[PDB]
């Protein structure tokens, strides 16, 4: 109950079966394009890979799933800090606009509050884990 | 079937095998990429005899492949049951890859007999950055290359 923010988050797996560079992008409300997950994480403050990878794949032994994520790291590699990540979600005007979308419209259940980037990060990570689990036929 | 081979079950089998589509993907277990620097030898000791049979004699214009090939190895493991199932030779399979990529891909293979079924491929450089090129060539290999049959003809069943 409360305004009823009917915003549905889509986490897409691009590339088909036996197609080179299978990238993962997510569609955020009030942003035209589907942003590569790696940027969304860096926008949330989780900057290194293997920290972003740590949030998606829990078992650091599952080589199958980890190789399924190597293309995502490449797609996101162009951005390296939170600013550069918030800006890709667009000057000064776009960076501020981004913070707002991720706060109140991205994963509005959980919280619309503020400092719950880790709680929303592990959640996005849970979605990507769930996505790859079906893709690997598990 | 032809009017004279109406009951010849072997004629049916023979057409059935000659018409049914068979890709390199159909017989592959797993594909692999290794850093095998000197092409004249191997880091993988399993393939010690594979180089000792083919990279061996001949010797069909040695160096032949300039031997100034590629340090990046592409290795395919083929299924023994699936190979015999669709009736295929390692030589057959090898010749299809060898004929697909012509002289820009140096191919070798483990023999039918051998405990493991392996196809060793190296890129042929004319006169840096290759890791991507191999993932491109293996995608071609699996999804494209036809080994036996007519395209679109997917499953072939015999009937009396």
């Amino acid at each position: 109950k409360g305004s009823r923010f009917i915003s549905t988050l889509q986490v897409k797996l691009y590339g088909r079966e036996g197609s080179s560079a299978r990238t993962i992008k997510a569609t955020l409300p009030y942003i035209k394009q589907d942003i590569p997950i790696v940027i969304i994480f860096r926008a949330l403050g989780i900057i290194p890979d293997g920290e972003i990878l740590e949030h998606i794949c829990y078992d650091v032994n599952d080589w199958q799933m980890l190789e399924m994520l190597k293309p995502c790291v490449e797609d996101g590699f162009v951005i390296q800090d939170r600013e550069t990540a918030l800006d890709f979600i667009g000057k000064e005007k776009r960076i501020q606009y981004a913070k707002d979308i991720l706060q109140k419209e991205f994963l509005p259940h959980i919280t619309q509050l503020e400092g719950f980037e880790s709680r929303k990060a592990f959640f996005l990570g849970y979605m990507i884990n769930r996505l790859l689990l079906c893709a690997l036929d598990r | 079937l032809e009017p004279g081979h109406a009951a010849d079950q072997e004629q049916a089998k023979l057409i059935r095998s000659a018409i049914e589509h068979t890709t390199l993907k159909s017989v592959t277990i797993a594909s692999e990429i290794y850093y095998d620097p000197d092409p004249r030898s191997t880091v993988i000791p399993e393939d010690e005899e594979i180089i000792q049979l083919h990279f061996s004699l001949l010797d069909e214009e040695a160096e032949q492949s300039f031997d100034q090939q590629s340090p990046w190895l592409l290795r395919l493991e083929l299924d023994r049951a699936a190979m015999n199932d669709k009736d295929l030779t390692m030589g057959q399979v090898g010749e299809r890859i060898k004929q697909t990529f012509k002289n820009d891909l140096f191919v070798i293979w483990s023999e039918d007999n051998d405990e493991k079924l392996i196809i060793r491929c190296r890129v042929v450089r004319p006169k840096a950055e290759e890791d991507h090129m191999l993932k491109k060539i293996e995608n071609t290999m699996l999804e494209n290359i036809t080994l036996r049959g007519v395209e679109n003809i997917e499953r072939v069943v015999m009937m009396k």
Binding site: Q64, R138 | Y34
Partner: protein
């Protein structure tokens, strides 16, 4: 496969050839890190996968009432106390093999008579 990260910025490590000494290294593309490769294997495909069959074998596997029970003696402890499931590999082709978990030693074993399996 089983890959590493850059100690210094935890970022992914990409391959690089040391042509002079004919050896493989892994470099950081966010800093000046480099390290000798462990194995010569770089990429592994796997078209026919067999990993994801014995998935979710938690020690509490016995506490699931939905799971059936058999009176097959254990090949390691010899207990007629089992909880059995079928291949967790959710692929169309998948064989109807049975995986049995002992409720007196917590060790898995199959009904498979085609292969001498130890996984």
């Amino acid at each position: 496969t089983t890959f590493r990260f850059c100690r210094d910025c935890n970022n992914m490590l990409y391959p690089r050839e040391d042509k002079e000494n004919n050896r493989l290294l892994f470099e950081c593309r966010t800093c000046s890190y480099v390290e000798e490769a462990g194995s010569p294997l770089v990429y592994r495909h796997e078209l026919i996968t067999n990993i994801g069959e014995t998935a979710g074998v938690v020690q509490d596997i016995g506490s699931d009432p939905t799971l059936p029970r058999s009176d097959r003696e254990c090949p390691k402890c010899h207990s007629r106390e089992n909880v059995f499931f079928q291949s967790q590999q959710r692929r169309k082709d998948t064989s109807m093999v049975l995986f049995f978990v002992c409720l007196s030693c917590s060790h898995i074993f199959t009904s498979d008579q085609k292969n001498k399996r130890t996984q």
